[PDB]
Design a binder for this molecule. Structure first.
Ligand SMILES: CC(=O)Nc1ccc(C(=O)O)cc1NC(N)N
Ligand SMILES: CC(=O)Nc1ccc(C(=O)O)cc1NC(N)N
Ligand SMILES: CC(=O)Nc1ccc(C(=O)O)cc1NC(N)N
Ligand SMILES: CC(=O)Nc1ccc(C(=O)O)cc1NC(N)N
Ligand SMILES: *[C@@H]1O[C@H](CO)[C@@H](O)[C@H](O)[C@H]1NC(C)=O
Ligand SMILES: *[C@@H]1O[C@H](CO)[C@@H](O)[C@H](O)[C@H]1NC(C)=O
Ligand SMILES: *[C@@H]1O[C@H](CO)[C@@H](O)[C@H](O)[C@H]1NC(C)=O
Ligand SMILES: *[C@@H]1O[C@H](CO)[C@@H](O)[C@H](O)[C@H]1NC(C)=O
Ligand SMILES: [Ca+2]
Ligand SMILES: [Ca+2]
Ligand SMILES: [Ca+2]
Ligand SMILES: [Ca+2]
Ligand SMILES: [Ca+2]
Lengths: 390, 390, 390, 390
């Protein structure tokens, strides 16, 4: 049979370059003959043989007649869908995996693990599916909108880890991690440390011994909760990133939250999922992060890097590495994933570029993708090309 | 070569949860650019590597111009179609298997057996197809609308069983079972017991020794004929379920048919196919059934359970386990199937949710699917989302 | 590697039954959202693992804007296309094999051999393609519309035979057979006997030693030239079928051509391709043929059978076996093919049912398919369901 | 694992014949229900098991609403797309490989190498992708529109070569070759000889020891730079073809550039990519080339041949072999590729036939394909069939 997947060293490179864009709505004109699915929270996850593009469709297409509701996040119609990376996510092209208004997915080397969450707000449920079969579920512990990553889970030697979180969007949401194995949950991991609010974690393997995440704190701070999970002892701790280059939105001027690394600063009520990914080298660790270009709105998107250091205690601003999206273009949830190449892993960052033209029309997303390629500086940005009045 | 499929123990779980919905007509607006096939009597059947979604299309799509006739059940255009479970059943996406206005299908571990029925009413024919080849047929014994399950046939060690029935919808219809093997019929099984009317059987393996079914009796009773087929001796007997929780539609108040289990009660002319499925445990048997929420109309749908007991003689009402569809939504034929997971079977229930807006427009169905997942109570219901005036 | 295909004994059965219909234009309304390709001369050919549906598209779809010319047979746009048997032949679904306005195809057990003919009328060319590669060609010997079978070629032990014909539609057209092998022609076979006009041969294996065909004679007779090709010595002879049940169209009353079997009778200028297929049994040969129901027009279609006998010398009318299409429905070119089942061959007959509504609109075809299944009599006919004004 | 691909001897044949046409816009009427992608610079590349059709889409379909810009060559929306040879390149059918406004691709026997170029004009970048992973990049050396072949790269024993060029379209553009291996560049090859302007090289293997190309010189001459690359020593030299049959466009009367082979003649500002391909025989080399029929405009297309000889020093006009496209039809970029057959290579020529109706509407291309087949003379030409006002 095949073998279990493990993280290898990253492929050599030093900069990130535009790689692909998936703009389904370039094909959704009334005069056109297509039907791209209406989606949001897209993410990409790969296996040894291929990468797939996931999303949560609102079960409607463009052009269509079910646009009311597309702008909201939860309902009985939402489904986690997927197409192979490179295909346009359309009605026929897409494969519906399960009903869900929050989700994750990851390949363990053998089959795919799809995660989905749905049910009432006051009592939602995390559904786990192994390939073709529905394998397990997990209930609401804090009874306020159980939810998940919205990016890929990470599997090592057959065990996949996954952050889940229950709680108020504007208050307390203590997250927990799940060690799933072959569809079945085999251990819950209660994180230690600064746990008042951690949601939408973007996780990855810094090594075979540790998974790390840059998450969202939706109520108390503009800084980002940074999880470090020890896979050896299935223990996890959280502390705020110390860097002055605050990675959340909305947020204030860099390095303006006075105090120790642990200082929240003003609430800056709100947040956004942020891409983060590791570039493991033999004797160094490259950590890459994205941030919107606007301090206040979800416009534009920049890439940062900081080799080595403890995110928990280093105040130093991250190194700017390029503008993937400009302030004139939409920059929403961003995430990281890794393409598996013959001998090494290629770290990447996908950016959900949302089309939003009010709540009186359709609402959907495009997916831009930057990956580590050779050297130099990042050279070009991404535009969607989509005109919403077509 | 591959091996023959057998029933294993069910995967551990205790409750059923919403898993997936397939609502093709969410994409059939005049302003949209899709073409979901117009169908009815959908069912799902799986193999070791995948599940497929079957149905009987009226050979027309939405939007289209051949809506007259869609509301009727038999004609020279109807075809048994299929897509992989998760794909939207559209003109291009679908694969046409054979001409048929009644059907079944099941995978034996090696290839697929598709069943289809067509021909004149007074002399229809059961056509059997092994994979790509047309292998055998079976004629009308009672010369009044020969018909079949409308859900999956069950194969064990290479032999597939299938209930067929000939007779008046409003009178006598004695069913027979067929032991097919590799496309060819190798034995007819004449059932013993209460055989005055048994149609649309929903069958499954309670064990390696016995197949069991909950069928429809269209003329004499609101109770359901319950078939028990001994695979060792290819013998089958039928008796009415004794439970007070009558599973058919239309039907009267529970436990109001006075008399022994064998008492029909008032005719309650009409019926409906009902989902039923087994949850085999090492030392126990879990039997699950669906019933519409309305006593009189095909609106809503509830899940029931009763571990162990003889359905033939136990008066006890079944245990309610959840509302999969509410009385505001359509609840028509329901069925059960089992997903094959690496080491166990995952029992499930699909519900055909029909869009019916008169006989002066299109008529088609959506497919909701609940499967056994973890614990707790069933949490959420299914809606179709479809507006028929689009 | 795989092995070479050979003819085996037919699967046991005694009658033919409706199996499938492919009516693409049921989905070509202006209000619909599909694009079935506009085609003609469809045929079906199988391999050990699957059957494919071939045709010659006019490189335009319905609804579309290139209907002028669809009614004619030859031009620089026509292409031989194919979809797997069961899929609707649409723009995206179809695979374009080569440019051709006449064609054939057959699987040798290993790869597919596609044949196509195109070029000027006074000097056309037979193009042979082995799988993905263009392998050989063959030129016009009589310089008047080189053309081919329009149904499957037959391969035995790696050698495929194929009838080609050059000459006037209203005069002399001596056909020749080609023994192709792995894409390359390795021998021409000049037929002996009654060679004044033989076109559109429908061929098959009566055994491992002989291929036989029922062809069209377009100028001199209503009877059908019957080719017998000895695969041992690659020699072929032709004589007219002696039967009174004349199988061509137009034609006069059965048994009314007075004289020996070799008597042509009145010209009955015109012809039509006719389905023919073998049902080889251990000690008997079943030969099946189709004929339109109307003596003069291409309306309706009937099945005939005659076990054993020499088609060359038996005057006996064939045995009627059923009406596959009624006189109210279109019955054009018909053909025979054989599905390969695990241990035997299943003979079949496809009927091209043409939609013709003048030369001032689209012109295309549907494909009905009857195969040998069990016993009894053929029970039901085929209708297209297509309304041309939609 | 599989083996590395090498060039074998060509399949025997002597002439070229029309093989296939891909005219997506035959299906892009407003009244039709399709969506062929709007593209340009199409090319075809094969592997041991299949050929794929590549192109640079303008990320818009017909009919659609994003036609402005389609006529230009560079922007942030352009993507290198592909479908299997024979499929119509449509939104759903196509697979998007990467963002790029110039590209190449080739199969090494194991996986596919896709090449793409994008970024600012004054500093573009060559992106290399190995199968699913982004593997390497290469920067602008002359800072003026880095660009690539626009036809297939050639791989031998695991090493793929690829011409890249940087410089002014109307001045100096010295090209370089890249020896890529498994996604990673492992050597740059600076060509010796007449290097003032060489772009859009159409390359192939004349043998295992040498790759050869017919390229474009956009500013100085109507003659074509002819590259000869020694794979043994990874060295390359360039000189102008000496033949009087000038293969570029615009160009003057044949044999009218007076002087040695090295004489440029008048600038004839402009150029066009031209198909070229080798027909390697045991003891001879057949070189085939295409040229537009019009000396000044990109209308029509003719095939030429010249067995043996040094293109660098032979003045002899090439031998005309046929008109693939007439002067009434569009003849733009042409290229050569080779289908891999069981035991030999089948050389071919694809012709990009562009639909151009001003800059106030859509702009796209069709792909005609001639391959070496049997003997005789080329018999028939290609038309597109497309009416731009539909
Ligand atoms: C489950 C859910 O509501 N997912 C979301 C999706 C989008 C957005 C969003 O920020 O647009 C927010 C949420 N919720 C949280 N808590 N971030
Ligand atoms: C063959 C056939 O008529 N199938 C049906 C389909 C639907 C329905 C139905 O209840 O909607 C009924 C039938 N017939 C029976 N006897 N139940
Ligand atoms: C090559 C070609 O013309 N094929 C045809 C197709 C249809 C028809 C037809 O009968 O409709 C006729 C022909 N020609 C001949 N000779 N039968
Ligand atoms: C990169 C780029 O501009 N590619 C082109 C495409 C088409 C055309 C063309 O000739 O239509 C020209 C170019 N550029 C050059 N230098 N030939
Ligand atoms: C983890 O272990 C496997 C080899 O056992 C391999 O993926 C890799 O060397 C290790 N991970 C890293 C980042 O080195
Ligand atoms: C039936 O037999 C096979 C093993 O021979 C296996 O599927 C299973 O153990 C048996 N079925 C059940 C329900 O135990
Ligand atoms: C032809 O030969 C092979 C076995 O060698 C097999 O297909 C079959 O027995 C023979 N054909 C017939 C019709 O018997
Ligand atoms: C190149 O080498 C391989 C055999 O090693 C084979 O492709 C061929 O014989 C050689 N190429 C040519 C053109 O002969
Ligand atoms: Ca925050
Ligand atoms: Ca489609
Ligand atoms: Ca009843
Ligand atoms: Ca005739
Ligand atoms: Ca030039």
């Amino acid at each position: 049979e095949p073998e279990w997947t493990y993280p290898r060293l990253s492929c050599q490179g030093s900069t990130f370059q535009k790689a692909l864009l998936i703009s389904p709505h370039r094909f959704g004109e009334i005069k056109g003959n297509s039907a791209p699915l209406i989606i949001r929270e897209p993410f990409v996850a790969c296996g040894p043989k291929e990468c797939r593009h996931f999303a949560l469709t609102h079960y409607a297409a463009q052009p269509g007649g079910y646009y009311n509701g597309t702008r909201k996040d939860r309902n009985k119609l939402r489904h986690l869908v997927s197409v192979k990376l490179g295909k346009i996510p359309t009605v026929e092209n897409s494969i519906f995996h399960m009903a869900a208004w929050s989700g994750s997915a990851c390949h363990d080397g053998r089959e795919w693990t799809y995660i989905g969450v749905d049910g009432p707000d006051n009592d939602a449920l995390v559904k786990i599916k192994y390939g073709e079969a529905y394998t397990d579920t997990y209930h609401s512990y804090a009874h306020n909108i159980l939810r998940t990553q919205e990016s890929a889970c990470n599997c090592i030697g057959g065990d996949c880890y996954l952050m889940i979180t229950d709680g108020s969007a504007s208050g307390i949401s203590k997250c927990r991690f799940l060690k799933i194995r072959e569809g079945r949950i085999i251990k819950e991991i209660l994180p230690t440390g600064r746990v008042e609010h951690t949601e939408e974690c973007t996780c990855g393997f810094a090594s075979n011994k540790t998974i790390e995440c840059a998450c969202r704190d939706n109520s108390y701070t503009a800084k980002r909760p940074f999880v470090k999970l020890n896979v050896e002892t299935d223990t996890a701790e959280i502390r705020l990133m110390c860097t002055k280059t605050y990675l959340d939105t909305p947020r204030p001027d860099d390095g303006s939250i006075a105090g120790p690394c642990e200082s929240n600063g003003d609430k800056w009520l709100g947040g956004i999922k942020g891409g983060f990914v590791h570039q493991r080298m033999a004797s160094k660790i490259g950590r890459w992060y994205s941030r919107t270009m606007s301090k206040t709105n979800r416009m534009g998107m920049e890439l940062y890097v900081k080799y080595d250091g403890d995110p928990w205690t280093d105040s130093d601003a991250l190194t700017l590495s390029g503008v993937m999206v400009s302030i004139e273009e939409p920059g929403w949830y961003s995430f990281g994933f890794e393409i598996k190449d013959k001998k090494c892993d290629v770290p990447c960052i996908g950016i959900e570029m949302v089309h939003d033209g009010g709540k009186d029309t359709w609402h959907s997303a495009a997916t831009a993708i930057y990956c580590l390629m050779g050297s130099g500086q990042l050279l070009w940005d991404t535009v969607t090309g989509v005109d919403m009045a077509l």
